C-alpha cells in the first residue's frame, strides 16, 4: 500500500519549500560567504556566538595565522558545534 | 584542560568520529599548560569551518527530505 | 526528543516550519493579483468571442486563446 | 514537551504545520503557473503590436492593455 | 495558561483577536459600498443588453461585459 | 481563568473569535475583489471616452458615469 | 456578574443595548418612507412597461430599469 | 440579579435584546440600501432632464418627479 | 432632619448612587437646625430637575424597549 | 430558536407606538418645556405635587436664587422622586 | 468629603438603625453642613452608641 | 459545527450598531474633545463626578500646572476609575 | 493617606498593573502629611486622562466584539 | 469570640482596654480621649468616617 | 524604585492587613515620597509588626 | 483525514489578517523606527515603561555612550523583557 | 545586586539562553558595589534592543501562524 | 515547624536569636540593630523592600 | 569565561537557593566583573556554605 504519486510529489513540493527556508541557516551563511576570509558571515554570527567574535577579529586583520589559547579554542569549538546543531538563529 | 578535551570530544562526535581532520593534533597542544597558545594557519581554520558548515547544511537538508518522505508515508 | 515517523523533532524544526508558513503566506498574498488578472483576461476572451476552450478555464490554453482572439481583430 | 515560543513541540504539531505547508505550497505552485501564463499572454500581445507593447511587463495592466488593443482594433 | 490545540493562549491573544475583529469590521463597513456599486453596474449591463453572462453575477467577467456593452453603443 | 476586560480567556473564547475572524476575512477578500472589479470597469470606461473620464476614480459615481456614457451614446 | 457565553454582563450592558434598540427604532421609522417611495417607483416601471425585471422587485436593478424606462420615452 | 431600571440583568435578557438588535440591524441595512437605490434613481432622472432636476434630492417627491417626467414625455 | 436625610437617600438611590451632583452638599446644610434655609441658584435647581427628568425619560423608554423585546421573545 | 424577523419587527412597531404614548410623562413635560424657567411644566405639575408649587412660585418671579427650607426641600426632593418613578399622571 | 460621611452614615444606618431614631445621627449631621469644623460629643453618648452597636451585633450573633 | 457565514455577518452588523451606540461613552467624550485642554468634556462630566469639577476649574484657567491635594487627587483618581469602568452616564 | 494609597491601587489594577506611568511617583508625595499639595504639569494630567480614556474605549469596543462573536456562536 | 463581645465584657467605664486592643488593628483615635478620661470627644469629619467604618466592621467581623 | 516599594506594600497588605489599619503603613509611606532618605522607626513598633505577621501566619497555619 | 484545501487557505487568510494586526506591537514599533537613534519609538514607549524613559533621555541627546547604574539597568532589562513578552500595549 | 542578577537571568531565558550577546559581560560590572555605573556604547544598546525586538516580533508572528495551523486542524 | 513559629517562641526581647537563624537564608539587616539593642532602626527604601518580602515569605513558608 | 561562571551560579542557585539570599552570592559576584583577579573569602564562610548545601541535599535525601 504505497502512497500515491500525487502524495509523493506533494511531499516533494513541501521539501523544496522547506529547503528554500533552510537556506538561511548559519551553516549556509558560512557556505555562501564569498569573502576570501569569512568576514561577513562572522560579522553576522558575532552577535550570536563568542567564538565567532574571536575568529572575526584576526580574520578582518588578514592575518596569515591566528593564535588561539585554551579559552578561545573552546569558544571556537563550541561555535562550530552550534553551527552543526543549527542552534544559531540568524536574524 | 579537561574542558577543552571534552569539547573536542563533543565536536568530534558531531563532525569527525575517527578524528581525521588535521585540526585535531594542532589543537591538542592546548591540553598542556606550558602550551598557553597555538599558532594556527588561517586557511586551516577556514577549511575546518567550511567542513563543519557543509556537513551541517547537508545534514539539515537531508533531515528535511526524511521529514517529507515520512509525510508522504502518512503513518508518522 | 519527539519524533515524526522516526525523524527527530526539536524546537528548531517547529520554528523553521512556522517561518516557512509566514514567508509562504506573504508570497501567496503577493501572487493573488496574478490569478485575478488572469481570470479577467480569460473572461475578456470568453465574452468577446464565445467558442471552444472559452467554456473551461485553463491557464495553459489562455495564451493561445489570446493569440487567436487578438489576431482575429 | 519542548516548546518554541508558545507552541508545544511534538508529533502532532509538526504534522499540522506540515499539512498547512503542503496546501500552501500547492497554492504557490498554482499561482506561479498563473504568473507564467500572464507572461506568455504579454509576449503574445507584444508580438501583435510591438511598436507600443515593448515597454515593460506589468500584471495589473495587462488586462487593461488587452482591452485597449481591442479598443484600437 | 490555557491552550488552543497546543499553542499557549494569554490575555494578549484575546485582546489582539478582538482588536482584529473591530478593525476588520470598520474595513468591511467601508467596503460594502463597492459591492453595491458593482451590483448596480452589473444590473445596468443585464437590463440594457440581455445576453450570456448577464444571466449570472460574476465580478471577474463584468469589466469585460462593460467593454462589450459600452463599445456596442 | 485569565481575563481580558470582561471576557474569560480560554480555548473556547479563542475558537469563537477565530471563527468570527475567518468569516470576516473571507468577506473582506470578496469586497476587495469587488473593488478591483470596479477599478477595472473604470479603466474600461476611461479608454472608451478618455477625453472626460480621466479625472479621478470614485466608486460611488462610476455607476452614474456608466449611465451617463449611455446617455450621451 | 452574570455572563453571556463567557463575557461579563452588567447593568451598563443592558442599558446600552436598550439605548441601541430605541435609537435604531427611530432610525427605522425615519427610513420606512424610502421603502415606500422605492416600491412606488418600481410599480411605475412595472405598470407602464411590463418586461423582464419588472417581474421581480430588485432595488439594485431598479435604477437601471429607470434608465431604460425613461430613456425610451 | 443586578437590575437596570425595571429589567433584570442576566444571560437571557441580553440574549433577547441581542436578537432584537440583530433583526433591527438587518432591517436598517435593507432600508439604507433602499435609500441608496433612490439616490441612484434620482441621478438617472437628473441626467435625463438636468435643466430642471438639479434642484435638490427629496425621496418623497422622486416618485412624483418620475411621474411628471412621464407626463411631459 | 432625619426625614430630609432619608429622602435625600431615596432620591440618591433613584438618580445618583455615588452622589456626584453638586446639589447634594448644597442641600446638606438643612440637616443642621441653625441653617433654617439655604439660598440656591435657580440655574442649579433647574439643571438638577433636568438631570432627573432626562434620566427618568430614558429609563421609561428603555423599559418599553425591554418589554417589546420580551414580547418578541414570546416566553415572558 | 430565535423569533422570526416579522415577530421582531412587530415588536418594534409596538415599541414605537408605546414610546409615542410615553411622550406624555411628567419627565417629558419637564424636558420639552422651552420656557427659560420651567414655568409651564411646573404650572401643569403644581396640580399633582406640592414641590412643583414650591418651585413654581419663585421661578415665575424670575428670581436668580431660590431659598428653600427643610420642608420645602423635602417636598422638592419628593417631587423629583415622583418624576423619576413616573407616578405623576399628567392629564 | 461630606458625601463620603453621608454614605458611611447610610451604610452604618442599614445595619444599626434603619429609621435613624438615635440622637447621635442629628448630633453628627453638622459635619455634613459646614467645612473646617468638628462636633464635640459626650463620651457617655459615644460609648453608649458603641454598646448599642455591640448589642445589635450580639443579636445578630445569636441569630 | 461552525456558525454559518450569514450568522457571523449578522453578528458583525450587530457589532457595528452597538459600537456606534458606544461612541457616546465618557471615555469617548474625553477622546474626541478637540479643545487643547479638555474643557468641554470636563464641563459635561462635571455634572457626573467631583473629580471632573476639580480638574475643570484650573484647566479653564489655562494653568500650566495644577496643584492637587489628597482629597482632590482621590477624587480625580476615582473619576478616571469611573471613566474606565464606564459608570458615568453622559446624557 | 490610606485612602489615597488604596485608590491608587484600584486605578492601578484597572489601568496600569506594573505602574509605569509617570503620574504614579508624582502622586506618591501626597502619602506624606507634610506634602499637603503637589504641583503637577497640566499636560501630564491631560495625557494620563487620555491614556485612561483610550484604554477604556478600546476595552469597551472589544467587549462588544466579544459579545457579538459569542452571539454568532449561539451557545452563550 | 467577637470584637463587640470583648467591648461588652470589658468592665472599664471607658472600656479603654478593648479600645486599645482593637485600635492596634483599627483606625480609632478614640483610644486617647477615652484613656485620658475626657468628658467629651472632638470629632471631625475624617475621624467620624473612621468611627462609622469601624463600628460597621466590628458589627460584622473583626476578630483578631 | 518607589514603584517597587509600593507594589511590595500591596503584596504584603493582601495577606497581613487588607484595610491597612496598622500605623506602620503610614510610617513607611514617606519612603515613596522623597528620594535619598530613610525612615527611623522604633524597634518596638517593628518587632510588634513582625509578631503581628507571626500571629496572622499562625492563624493561617491553624486553618 | 487532513483538512481540505479550502480550510487551510481560510486559515491562511486568518493568519494574514492577524499578522497585519500584529504589526502594531511594541517590538514592531522599535523595528520600524527609522530614526538613527530609536527616539520616536522610545517616546511612544516612555508612556508604558520606565526603562524606555531612561534610554530615551540620553538617546535624544545624541550621546555616543550611555551611563547606566544598577537601577536603570534593571529597568532597561525589564523593558526589553516586556518587549519580548509583548506586554506593552501601544495605543 | 541580586535583583540585577535575577533580572539578567530572566531576560536571558527569554532572549539568549547561552548568553552570547556582548551586552552581558558589559552589564556584569554592576553586580559589584564599587562599579556604581557602567559606560556603554549607544550603538551596542541599540543593537541589543533591535535583537530583542526582531526576535520578539518573529516569535509573535510564528505563534500566530501556529494558531492558524491549529485552527485549520480543527481539533484544537 | 515554621519560621514565624520560631519567631513567636523566641523568648528574647529583641528575638535576635531567631533573627540570626533566619538571616542566614533571608536578606535582613535587621539582625545588627536588634542584636545591638538599638531603640530605633533606620530603614531606607531598599531595606524596606527586603523587609516586606521577608515578612511575606515567612508568612507563607521559609522552613529551614 | 564570566558567562560560564554566571551560568554555573544559576545552576547551583536553582537547587540550593532560589531567591539568592545567601551572602556568598554577592561575595562571588566580583568575579563576573573584572578580569585577572580573585576573591578572598573566609574558610568559615565557605565551609558554612558547603554545610548549607549538605543540609539542602539531606532534606532532598529525606524526600
Author numbering:
A (entry chain C), J (entry chain C), L (entry chain C), P (entry chain C): 29 to 119
B (entry chain D), I (entry chain D), M (entry chain D), Q (entry chain D): 3 to 78
C (entry chain B), D (entry chain A), E (entry chain B), F (entry chain A), G (entry chain B), H (entry chain A): 4 to 76
K (entry chain F), O (entry chain F), S (entry chain F): 2 to 64
N (entry chain E), R (entry chain E): 54 to 117
What does the published report state?
Baculoviruses have their large circular dsDNA genome packaged into an enveloped rod-shaped nucleocapsid. The BV nucleocapsid structure consists of three parts, a central helical sheath containing the viral genome, an apical cap and a basal structure attached to both extremities of the helical sheath. Herein, we report high-resolution cryo-electron microscopy (cryo-EM) structures of the BV nucleocapsid combined with de novo modeling and Alphafold predictions.
The BV apical cap displays a prominent crown-like structure sitting right above the C2 symmetric part of the BV portal, adopting a C21 symmetry and being the vertex of the apical cap. The asymmetric unit of the C21 ring observes a distinctive ‘sickle’ shape, characterized by a straight vertical ‘handle’ domain, connected to a ‘hook’ domain. Thanks to a higher resolution for this ring structure (3.5 Å), the extensive modeling analysis indicated three different proteins, each one in two copies, contributing to form this crown-like C21 ring. The handle region comprises a dimeric Ac66, spanning N-terminal amino acids 4-75, with the remaining amino acids of Ac66 conspicuously absent in the C21 ring structure. The ‘hook’ portion of the asymmetric unit consists of two sets, each constituted of two proteins: Ac101 and Ac102. The first set, encompassing N-terminal amino acids 29-119 of Ac102 and 2-78 of Ac101, is positioned closer and perpendicular to the handle part of the assembly whereas the second set, including amino acids 54-117 of Ac102 and 2-63 of Ac101, is located at the tip of the hook. Within an asymmetric unit, Ac101 pairs up with Ac102 in a heterodimeric arrangement. The interaction between these two proteins is pervasive, extending intimately across the entire modeled length of both proteins, with a spectacular β-strands pairing forming an intermolecular β-sheet. Ac102 of the first set engages in intermolecular interactions with Ac66 through various polar interactions including a potential salt bridge between the Lys32 of Ac66 with Asp41 of Ac102.
